Amino acid sequence: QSTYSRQIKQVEDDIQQLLKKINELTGIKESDTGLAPPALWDLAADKQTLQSEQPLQVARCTKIINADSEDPKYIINVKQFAKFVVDLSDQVAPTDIEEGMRVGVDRNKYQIHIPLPPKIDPTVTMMQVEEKPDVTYSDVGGCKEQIEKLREVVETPLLHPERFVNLGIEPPKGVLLFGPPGTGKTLCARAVANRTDACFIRVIGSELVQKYVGEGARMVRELFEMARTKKACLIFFDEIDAIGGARFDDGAGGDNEVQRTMLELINQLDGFDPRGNIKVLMATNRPDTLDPALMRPGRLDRKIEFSLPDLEGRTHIFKIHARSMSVERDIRFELLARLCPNSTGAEIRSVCTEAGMFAIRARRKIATEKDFLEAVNKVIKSYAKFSATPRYMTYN
Amino acid sequence: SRRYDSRTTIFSPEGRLYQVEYAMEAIGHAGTCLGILANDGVLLAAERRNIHKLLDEVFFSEKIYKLNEDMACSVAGITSDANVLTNELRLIAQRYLLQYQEPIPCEQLVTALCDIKQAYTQFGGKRPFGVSLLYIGWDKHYGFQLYQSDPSGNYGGWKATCIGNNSAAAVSMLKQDYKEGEMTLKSALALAIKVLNKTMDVSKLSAEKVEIATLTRENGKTVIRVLKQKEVEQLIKKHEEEEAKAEREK
Amino acid sequence: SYDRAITVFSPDGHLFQVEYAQEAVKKGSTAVGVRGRDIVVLGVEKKSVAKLQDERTVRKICALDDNVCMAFAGLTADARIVINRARVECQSHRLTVEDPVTVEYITRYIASLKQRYTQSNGRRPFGISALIVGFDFDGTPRLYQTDPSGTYHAWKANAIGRGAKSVREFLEKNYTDEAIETDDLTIKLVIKALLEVVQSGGKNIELAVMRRDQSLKILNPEEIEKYVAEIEKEKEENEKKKQ
Amino acid sequence: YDRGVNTFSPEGRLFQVEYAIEAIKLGSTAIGIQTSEGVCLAVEKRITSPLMEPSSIEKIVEIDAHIGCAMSGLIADAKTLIDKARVETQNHWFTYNETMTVESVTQAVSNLALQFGEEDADPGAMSRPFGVALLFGGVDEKGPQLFHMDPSGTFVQCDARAIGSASEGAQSSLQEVYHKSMTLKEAIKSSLIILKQVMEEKLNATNIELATVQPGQNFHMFTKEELEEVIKDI
Amino acid sequence: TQCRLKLLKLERIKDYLLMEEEFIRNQEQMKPLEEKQEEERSKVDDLRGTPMSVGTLEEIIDDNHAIVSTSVGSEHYVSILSFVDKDLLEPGCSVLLNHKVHAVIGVLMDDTDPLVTVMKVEKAPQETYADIGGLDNQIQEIKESVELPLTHPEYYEEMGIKPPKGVILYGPPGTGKTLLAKAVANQTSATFLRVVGSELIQKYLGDGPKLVRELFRVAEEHAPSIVFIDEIDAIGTKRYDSNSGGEREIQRTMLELLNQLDGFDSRGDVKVIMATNRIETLDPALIRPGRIDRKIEFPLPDEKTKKRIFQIHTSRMTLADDVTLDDLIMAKDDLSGADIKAICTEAGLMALRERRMKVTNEDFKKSKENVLYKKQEGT
Ligand SMILES: Nc1ncnc2c1ncn2[C@@H]1O[C@H](COP(=O)(O)OP(=O)(O)OP(=O)(O)O)[C@@H](O)[C@H]1O
Ligand SMILES: Nc1ncnc2c1ncn2[C@@H]1O[C@H](COP(=O)(O)OP(=O)(O)OP(=O)(O)O)[C@@H](O)[C@H]1O
Ligand SMILES: [Mg+2]
Ligand SMILES: [Mg+2]
């Protein structure tokens, strides 16, 4: 098409003129911004130089000598690691800054000025905060007591706290999820993670194993310091077996490091510490290993088992995963569930993939009744040779 | 108790029997031991695994046992287990003689042992017998034979085989040089010194480092003699005079 | 002594020992079996010979009785222990009942010997599968197949051991009554099926036929090379249906 | 990680026995309906090829001329039970001279159900529970009766049971279609309707076994001809 | 066609933009617009100042202030200045502070990772499939698990089914697991990370989970990526003493891999390929369906296949005429495509001791006899 081949010439070349002139009248690159609004920012930065208190050198209060006296004094401990007796703020009321509180001072005359933003210590812990994943409570089958237990103790007390205080009770804090691998301990938590709409802070069991003695325990400590401030959190200790251990002595200090971190976790959900109002999920798959003092009610009040689904469940779960793909008219999903023995929810995810594959491998546009019986043969029989469920099911 | 049980009679996830499989590797360390069939008799060659200046020899052979009047065998593996299997063989072969009043057929003697080696891998929870054997023999249904049993309980006839240290290297050398038929007992001893010389890393063999025992038929009775040091020393000189005349091409 | 429980139930509801013995079959050699109307042909693939072994001691097709033969695929060790007890049984039955064993009955006893071993103390399962083949007291052909579990079904055709899933896929389409109408067509059906899972031609397929009331003949290597020439001749006269 | 063969679950019941129950859910389907006219047993063969003879599969076996049986689960383990049943019923006929009540036979078979024992027994006892559930249906002096016997030794009389890989599904469709006033021809037709939904391949004359046991007859398995006649009606 | 009917409107958008910028530059200071911008940019290098001190952003205060840590480690509550993309200010990031005023002029630099130079590879692996002889099932599931979903993402979407997530290649050593890895690294032109399973054990405690964390992160930054783990057995079988806590620390390393392979953190478009030859010694939960979906197995080659392999390495050579390929193949048995290439390589070398280019039937006899003692000795 000479007409439309000619159109294609200047459809590339003219859009390239567009970009050319865009750059001729904006121009960006390895430059820090888009440079479009910050040109005026520049003229506010000339007011940031006049801002002479800035820079402000940051320290921490450690000891107030006088408070009732006309002249409060403080003992600042700065970052050059020399300590100063200092005056009070030049305006901020001397009621605000107690000892411990991290506080910024001026660098010339170490005059305390601006209270912080304490507990810097949270640097790794910072990153455990979450940004809502993409699974909802319909995408989960076997909706028996399973998911109605969990909502009851973790979601309902945060949406309707009036009905638990009118009765005069106090709902339970923690909830242990445990089951054979691939039965929706995480899925059921990916679920509550977004729908809850309250601060959600999941730590990965292994990320609390640190290098230096009692740094692990510090990690835990900082984690609850941060969660007590944010009023009403969840903490979701995923796959705790690391730092999930059980006390024991033998030989040369076996696991004495990891073990001590656990004692700190234990200690902050049961010590004296009343603690704010933070719920806690723990999803293992090996509950047999958890220390008894970590497991008993008042730290993990409700234990939810995720047993393998039954016939009725399976039938449900096939619908949850297959409904999304194109299938011929009449698939006996109830026959693919008689045909499954004790299967994980994650085994059935895999079946549907392969029924799709044979349809793709053979170039057809629709999976048939045959394609499942065939893909259900492949994924269960063969691959069941090396399954988790057999062995991993006693630790459950 | 159950904690201290090894469970030696049980399958692997893969479809093996680990103890019988390890027992093979224990045989790959024993002395080399090869056997060659001919038309005019058959012969076992084995290298003395233990040799030393102080060590003595009292017995006609330190690896060849006579199981009968008509059969001998050589062992390879755990020497201790070999004193057990060779005593049951002798007792089997007399218990055959006590019924049928004949010398026992070559094949049967082996299977009758391989029911005992095979039992141990299937129940009882003892460790298996870590031995493989070569049986040279003579019977009136097949003439000379050679056989090889494993700790599994598998046996086979062979016309020329090897078991124990560097077995696969011997067998590669036999596949090439051994003729189907056309073997005299003179020629087999040439092949047996040549194969043994290649799987052992010594510069040359010595009449005091090997043991060659033949099994011949002379006058309707069987004879099983072990070559003295002089008879083997001849064979070693005639092989060096075939390496001196295996450079006449350049 | 050594009263332990080797085979116990999984938590998934299997028996891992009898499922692991299933793998000791799959590491075996292919054997097939088709039954004609006057002739039953079972062939074992691979003599396993290395130009040094005898073909008289590597045989995998033994004969329980006179009308009953059996091919196996698994651990050669175990198979010889079953075959023995089977041969005893085959004579114990001639003593107490005048007729010779039927082919169902010597099977139900091989199977029932393998089932007891997966439910007794001390013992691991027998790691063999079997094709029991024979003729009844009525000239009828029969083909039975066991496995470590100790179950047994009859077949019209069947393959066990290595590469048996492929060979069953070839016998579904090729076993009709346009084949196995003659003694020459039934032998050619077996060979044509092992040629799909042997990678060295026909000079590697030991093949035994049994014919009505006569005893088991093992076909010497010459006759098998003649039959392999008729196969390869027939895949060049399928070029008259491609033109 | 290993334990005994005789360990209790801290829950409260025997590890193995709780497991051997799961081995049933792998097995074929059987349906037994008890009437005043007789007992019918229907069990699907579940052939796996077209090369198998749909006849050397036996999942209904005669125990005597008035006590049928249907196995689901590991059909290999039934071989030992069935043969104890027969030799039980015969011994009871050789001493007391008279048939045996169906209940008594099933009791005598259930006494083996718990009998494994890694040690402190013979070098011949079982090592593991039996992997098989039974449906003894017979006719004696109480009229027809049908018993269900699982690997727990707990046997119990039923008016209509289903076992196997469609125990859940079929059991619910029996509760809607069963009632005291039936005849034998209504039941054989009722069961094969339930058995036609829960199978995986089409219902031929080569995919089930029917048997019946009636007051005025023996145990009588239907042949391939007679089956054509009751699948025509459906 | 329509695309230029679209252009005719896109240009007008730009011509209008040109009206505004071309007039407002001359309304600004009778000069080009980039000349006014350059007046400003040089003036920003007056604000910016010289030098520029690198530091650490520790935390952000919403108020456009931030606590940074200079070289000394002394923290300063500074202000976030002009010309800074606040979306490039995450914790741990390197910032440019004023040497004198200490205020973040910004992260105007491409801070580098020295771990990506180890994990990523700018390869061109010569071996493509078609150089993998006679293992053809193996060659495909893979294409359905890795390469095909990147070439034709419309098949899986049209069917309505997620593409399968990860594969395990497992079999006897030598058969061709890593050779298939080379093949698919070549083709897909996704970023191809590669870490051996042993590298997941290092001296100091705790680094195991840390190295594992930062391997995925790398592969996430560069999505779409492939993460191959050659010989994942070595994590869980051979040990090295260096590590502390022994086997317990090995586990927590694995539990980390095991999470960040499935876990909670909504990842995407990172294929996984785990090779191994001991698969029976892997924590099942690791290879749980839905964590890894396809277990390709690599059996020893057939006889006719073993001939296509020995026919493929010899193709670049010149063989003497007395060489019978079929006599050397069957001569031995149970060969891996590694053993085949090892007999080819040796013999070709014997020809280079003689200064020829004809591998003779005897070069292969010496060779085959030096790879058999090789297989026989050192066992
Ligand atoms: N009840 C269920 N309904 C729907 N999908 C399920 C269910 N159970 C498991 N799955 C499927 O299994 C996949 C993985 O499950 P999940 O990872 O939550 O199991 P897990 O208990 O976290 O196992 P692991 O111990 O390996 O972390 C999910 O993505 C989901 O598709
Ligand atoms: N099937 C085959 N076809 C062609 N070449 C092969 C084949 N198998 C192996 N090779 C050759 O052997 C070489 C090494 O093999 P490869 O790296 O695949 O072994 P591997 O199976 O990964 O062993 P390991 O278990 O040690 O990882 C390859 O570079 C290739 O040239
Ligand atoms: Mg999880
Ligand atoms: Mg490799």
From Swiss-Prot, chain B:
One of its GO terms (biological process) is proteasome-mediated ubiquitin-dependent protein catabolic process. The modification N6-acetyllysine is found at residues 126, 175. InterPro entries: Ntn_hydrolases_N (IPR029055), Proteasome_alpha (IPR050115), Proteasome_alpha-type (IPR023332), Proteasome_asu_N (IPR000426), Proteasome_bsu_CS (IPR016050), Proteasome_sua/b (IPR001353). This is Proteasome subunit alpha type-4. Induction: Down-regulated by antioxidants BO-653 and probucol. It comes from Homo sapiens. NCBIfam families: PRK03996.1. The modification Phosphoserine is found at residues 12, 74, 172. Keywords: Acetylation, Cytoplasm, Host-virus interaction, Nucleus, Phosphoprotein, Proteasome. Component of the 20S core proteasome complex involved in the proteolytic degradation of most intracellular proteins. This complex plays numerous essential roles within the cell by associating with different regulatory particles. Associated with two 19S regulatory particles, forms the 26S proteasome and thus participates in the ATP-dependent degradation of ubiquitinated proteins. Its main location: cytoplasm. It is found in: Cytoplasm; Nucleus.
UniProtKB/Swiss-Prot annotation, chain C:
The modification Phosphotyrosine is found at residue 152. Glycans are attached at residue 129. Keywords: Acetylation, Cytoplasm, Glycoprotein, Host-virus interaction, Nucleus, Phosphoprotein, Proteasome. The keyword Nucleus applies. Phosphorylation by ABL1 or ABL2 leads to an inhibition of proteasomal activity and cell cycle transition blocks. One of its GO terms (biological process) is proteasome-mediated ubiquitin-dependent protein catabolic process. One of its GO terms (cellular component) is nucleoplasm. Coiled coil: none annotated. Its main location: cytoplasm. The modification N6-acetyllysine is found at residue 226. The 26S proteasome consists of a 20S proteasome core and two 19S regulatory subunits. The 20S proteasome core is a barrel-shaped complex made of 28 subunits that are arranged in four stacked rings. The two outer rings are each formed by seven alpha subunits, and the two inner rings are formed by seven beta subunits. The proteolytic activity is exerted by three beta-subunits PSMB5, PSMB6 and PSMB7. PSMA7 interacts directly with the PSMG1-PSMG2 heterodimer which promotes 20S proteasome assembly. Interacts with HIF1A. Interacts with RAB7A. Interacts with PRKN. Interacts with ABL1 and ABL2. This is Proteasome subunit alpha type-7. It comes from Homo sapiens. The lineage of its organism: Eukaryota, Metazoa, Chordata, Craniata, Vertebrata.
UniProtKB/Swiss-Prot annotation, chain D:
Its main location: cytoplasm. Keywords: Acetylation, Cytoplasm, Glycoprotein, Nucleus, Phosphoprotein, Proteasome. The keyword DNA damage does not apply. The modification Phosphothreonine is found at residue 48. The modification Phosphoserine is found at residues 9, 49, 56. The 26S proteasome consists of a 20S proteasome core and two 19S regulatory subunits. The 20S proteasome core is a barrel-shaped complex made of 28 subunits that are arranged in four stacked rings. The two outer rings are each formed by seven alpha subunits, and the two inner rings are formed by seven beta subunits. The proteolytic activity is exerted by three beta-subunits PSMB5, PSMB6 and PSMB7. PSMA5 interacts directly with the PSMG1-PSMG2 heterodimer which promotes 20S proteasome assembly. PANTHER family: PROTEASOME SUBUNIT ALPHA/BETA. Component of the 20S core proteasome complex involved in the proteolytic degradation of most intracellular proteins. This complex plays numerous essential roles within the cell by associating with different regulatory particles. Associated with two 19S regulatory particles, forms the 26S proteasome and thus participates in the ATP-dependent degradation of ubiquitinated proteins. This is Proteasome subunit alpha type-5. It comes from Homo sapiens. The gene is PSMA5.
From Swiss-Prot, chain E:
It is found in: Cytoplasm; Nucleus; Membrane. Residues 31-48 have a biased composition (Basic and acidic residues). One of its GO terms (molecular function) is proteasome-activating activity. Keywords: Acetylation, ATP-binding, Cytoplasm, Deafness, Intellectual disability, Isopeptide bond, Lipoprotein, Membrane, Myristate, Nucleotide-binding, Nucleus, Phosphoprotein, Proteasome, Ubl conjugation. GO terms for cellular component: cytosol; membrane; nucleoplasm; nucleus; proteasome accessory complex; proteasome complex; proteasome regulatory particle, base subcomplex. Residues 29-49 are annotated as: Disordered. The modification Phosphothreonine is found at residue 379. One of its GO terms (biological process) is proteasome-mediated ubiquitin-dependent protein catabolic process. It is linked to Birk-Aharoni syndrome: An autosomal recessive disorder characterized by failure to thrive, severe developmental delay, intellectual disability, spastic tetraplegia with central hypotonia, chorea, hearing loss, micropenis and undescended testes, as well as mild elevation of liver enzymes. Belongs to the AAA ATPase family. This is 26S proteasome regulatory subunit 4. The gene is PSMC1.
